[PDB]
């Protein structure tokens, strides 16, 4: 039947094991008959974004100029738009699912450049402050964590998975969120 | 005397660079002594490396740059210029003279730059016929001229100099306009 393509994002704070969670999302999608899909890295993910990264590093190494924060942001959204229009949207159009890692002024920019385009499911990997501290060895972070948790409550396309628990527990939960979500479609 | 930011706008062949010299000389006579020239297309290392980045991608012919991403890369240069060159200059008491500073284009401005506006915009009006002749030495041009002239009539911080007349006449008027505006401050 070749189910409708969809766009699934994997968000989370450092040490959430996002790349390892991406694998679990893919395995579950395989079990559900999803066979054709694309893994994109949202930081990076296109040649354009890679060349912007090398440009910023080429400038910072020399010195004699400092990239203003706002300038970098617009370059970040330029990278995201390039990914949405040249990789993600076409991939969906061919029938390929797309699984991605790490997708007031920020909101205004999004509503302008991306318009209504949003991920179909966003999987937020929550990690507690203790967990973040273990990974750093190998807290402004509580405020960012809080924002993610507000968006998860307000947004029906955001599902949270407690990433602090053992691997097989996270796999159980990701597999459950995906099954429930797929069935609803 | 509070630093000020003056922009010189106009269609190609309006001779904005020569106007920029004449604005400076009037300010020197009025006792303005420390100031900065900027070229709005370009004007930072960032803008320079963004321009070379676009051309390097064009000469390959194997990647297409989405239009929206490119515009974000255009506004990234403008933001860099305003935040690392212009605003610091005004803060040092230097004046700034700049050269050459769809509804969605303006919405980005209101998001990133906010209420920041040039103190004076100096519009050099040439008919698209006259301007193109001088460039050698179109509907898009006729529409853009109308937009500049309407904003000129409606915007008190915009003053217009007819550039279609001989250069010696343009020099008299530019010199008079800046002189008149400075008195009004
Ligand atoms: Cl991680
Ligand atoms: Cl010109």
Q: CA quadruple B3, B9, B12, B18: dihedral positive or negative?
A: negative
| Known binding-site residue numbers of B | 10-17
Asked if A85 contacts B68 with a C-beta cutoff of 8 angstroms, the reply is yes
Domains of chain A listed by start with CATH number: 7-43+94-184 (3.40.50.300)
CA of A56 to the centre of ligand 1 (A): 23
Rounded Cα distance between B145 and B9, Å, is 11
Closest CA to A109 of B90, B108, B134: B108
Rounded distance between C-alpha atoms, residue B183 and residue B174, angstroms: 14
Q: Which of B127, B121, B184 is nearest to B153 (CA)?
A: B121
For residue A180, the tally of other CB atoms under 10 A from its CB is 10
Experimental method: X-ray
What residues have their beta carbon closer than 5 A to ion ligand 1? A 18
CA distance B52 to chain A (A): 10
Output the CA–CA distances (angstroms, integers) from residue B41 to A181, B23, B59, B139, in the order listed. 48, 19, 21, 23
Chain A hits for B56, CB-CB cut-off 8 Å, are: 51
Q: Check if the beta carbon of residue B123 is closer than 8 Å to that of residue B160.
A: yes
CA distance B8 to B19: 8
What is the secondary structure of B112-179 as a DSSP string?
A: HTTT---SEEEEEE--HHHHHHHHH--HHHHHHHHHHHHHHHH-TTEEEEE-SS-HHHHHHHHHHHHH
Residue in B53, B70, B72 nearest the CB of A51: B53
Angle at A25 between CA A24 and CA A27, to 5 degrees: 65
Cβ contact A65–B44 (<8 Å): yes
CB-based contact B96:B3 (threshold 8 Å):
yes
Q: Is A95 annotated for ligand binding?
A: no
Rounded to whole angstroms, how far apart are CA atoms B176 and B111? 35
**Short-list B73, B51, B74, B56, CA closest to A75:** B73
Q: What are the structure tokens assigned to B18, written together? A: 């020569």
Q: For chain A, say whether B73 makes contact (Cβ under 8 Å).
A: yes
A107 touching chain B per CB within 8 A: no
């Amino acid at each position: 039947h070749h189910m409708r393509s969809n766009y699934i994002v994997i968000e989370g704070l450092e040490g959430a094991g996002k790349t390892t969670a991406r694998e679990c999302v893919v395995e579950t999608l395989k079990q559900l008959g999803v066979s054709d899909m694309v893994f994109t890295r949202e930081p990076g993910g296109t040649i354009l974004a890679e060349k912007l990264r090398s440009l910023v590093l080429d400038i910072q190494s020399t010195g004699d100029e400092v990239i203003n924060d706002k300038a970098e942001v617009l370059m970040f959204y330029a990278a995201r738009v390039q990914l949405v229009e040249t990789v993600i949207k076409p991939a969906l159009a061919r029938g390929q699912w797309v699984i991605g890692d790490r997708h007031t002024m920020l909101a205004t920019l999004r509503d302008a450049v991306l318009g209504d385009f949003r991920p179909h499911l966003t999987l937020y990997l929550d990690v507690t402050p203790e967990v973040g501290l273990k990974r750093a060895r190998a807290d402004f972070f509580n405020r960012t964590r809080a924002r993610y948790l507000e968006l998860a409550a307000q947004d029906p396309t955001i599902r949270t998975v407690d990433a602090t628990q053992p691997l097989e527990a996270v796999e159980r939960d990701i597999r459950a969120v995906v099954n429930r979500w797929v069935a609803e479609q």
